[PDB]
Amino acid sequence: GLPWYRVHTVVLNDPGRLISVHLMHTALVAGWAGSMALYELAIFDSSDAVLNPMWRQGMFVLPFMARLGVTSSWNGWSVTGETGLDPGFWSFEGVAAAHIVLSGLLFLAAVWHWVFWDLELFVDPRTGESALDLPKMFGIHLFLSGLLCFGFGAFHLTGVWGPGMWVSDPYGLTGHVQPVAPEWGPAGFNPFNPGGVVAHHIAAGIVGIIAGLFHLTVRPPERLYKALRMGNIETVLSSSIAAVFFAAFVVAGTMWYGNATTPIELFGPTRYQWDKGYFQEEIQRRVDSQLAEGASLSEAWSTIPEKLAFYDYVGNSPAKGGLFRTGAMNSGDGIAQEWIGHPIFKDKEGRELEVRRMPNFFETFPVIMTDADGVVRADIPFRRSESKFSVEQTGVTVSFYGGALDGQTFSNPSDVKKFARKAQLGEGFDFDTETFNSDGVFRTSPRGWFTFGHAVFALLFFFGHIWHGSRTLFRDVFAGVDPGLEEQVEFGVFAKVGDLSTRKEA
Amino acid sequence: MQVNNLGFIASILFVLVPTVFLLILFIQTGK
């Protein structure tokens, strides 16, 4: 009988049952989307869109609904933190319900196609055996894909008929769904320009329409029909797996590096924003602008939005998690409650010291404080027999500006060391570690988990491509080699490797 | 709810074990 790893080959020459198994897959995927959305809605906490956004709660499918315009729930709340919006049927709940219903409908259609497998559409009129014109199939489907791509770009994303797409300020503070006009210049190829995404869908949809028209009208060349085995559906599996792992690599990359289609208010900040101190640079600029205007240190640091300070915390970097540190990032450090304000550390001589921040690579990091011109003035020593730059020895003090500790000074070296360790992680926040019995080890965001899954799957789909492409090209030898091959594979006997018509006879 | 932390494994196994027994028996019928 069939080995366990080949059981699905029974639909290889049964177009009706192939459509059935594809409909069942589609049903399961849609049902997963709906049920995942309902689980997330059941556990989502919409009470504080600033310090507990969706990406702090392990929300995986919610950001994808939000990206395309579903931003509100029937329960009144909205992901932007606004309330009192009425989205009609198309809320998070409405979308989840639509997918569940679609899943049921696809399941019923799959049942019908399974039972009524032997439709005359699937047989070749001239012969008696089932046959699919794969080139013409591709023409129809490419034309449909082009129409859908054009429509999505020209109506949905533009807002002509549709909600638009999630767009935000470069620092992820004002995220909202909005119609996006297509950018037709070279700026459309900036991956952070949403107008580039709109333009692509209009233009690639048009090009797919034209290409589908050609593929609907012009038959494949004989050379290509034979070379790519166009009569074999496994050729389409081989090339589709190739295109799919290409797309999986692309989506993993754009998720990891940041994109207009991967905003930080939906999937969390990127590791490169931490590496480069992106938010730290912007926070210092806003503070320095207020200082130049004439504000005091406490007044200027009070202008800093807690949401901005939250992005500048290494615990929100997606490169701090673990493969088996499961769940929401709130299950790690806890639910963020409030920004504690900005520490400024000073030695007994009044030199301003900065704690060197933890890099993404390090699970542990020594506490080091350097002055303006990069000379270490204080640290937390490991060995205190010969220590020279201890906080205790150097009389470091820390004063807080803004946040909860605004206007407090801490001189007790215990608490100064505590805040120095806090400053290692960036801007400091108070956490509630009780709600989730938080364990104190960082998790990664939906950005990290998405990238991991799609990079791994892309890698595995490379094997699928080689496997199915080999099966397509080597179909005649799948069961083994010919009982001959005692003369063909010899060396020098033929001019051309494998060509029996090139025997040198010499 | 402060449920019995063993309720989920118990319910899952209570259903799945006889289920697999039945499935094994049904699928091998006719050998």
């Binding site: 689980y39 059941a42 049942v111 | 709810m1 449920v3 309720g7 989920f8 319910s11 899952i12 259903v15």
Partner: peptide
């Protein structure tokens, strides 16, 4: 999460009903 267990067992019951009706052993006159 006990809600997940309850919904899952209820769904198993309903799906068994569907299969028992849609795909039953066809009674045949022999």
């Amino acid at each position: 999460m006990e809600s997940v267990a309850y919904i899952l067992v209820l769904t198993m019951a309903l799906a068994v009903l569907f299969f028992a009706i849609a795909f039953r052993e066809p009674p045949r006159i022999e």
